């Protein structure tokens, strides 16, 4: 079986810091499966970080960046889309279990 937990969070950081996560991902012909529901995912998240306090964890997959779907969007364009918002980031992720 699969347990898919969708969670939508708003990340608010200061100028002198980061969101506190490492985005990893990726070709491009992508078929979302329950195990891999997206391409880009959080490889690590800094404990007590902005992202971390927001609820986000290692393994979460990035579905949306600021209301816009990034399910099939490349790594470059996603990092690029994250920077676009500056200190505010609304992100929609999925935590896949079992």
């Amino acid at each position: 079986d699969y347990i898919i937990k969708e969670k939508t969070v708003l990340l608010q950081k200061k100028d002198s810091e980061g969101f506190g996560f490492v985005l990893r991902g990726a070709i491009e012909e992508f078929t979302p499966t329950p195990a891999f529901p997206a391409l880009q995912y959080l490889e690590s998240v800094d404990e007590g970080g902005v992202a971390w306090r927001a609820g986000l964890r290692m393994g979460d997959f990035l579905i949306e960046v600021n209301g816009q779907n990034v399910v099939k969007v490349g790594h470059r364009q996603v990092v690029n889309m994250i920077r676009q918002g500056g200190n505010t980031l609304m992100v929609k992720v999925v935590m896949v279990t079992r």
Binding site: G18, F19, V22, G25, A26, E43, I82
Partner: peptide
């Protein structure tokens, strides 16, 4: 490929 955010 990775990025620190």
């Amino acid at each position: 490929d990775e990025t620190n955010l």
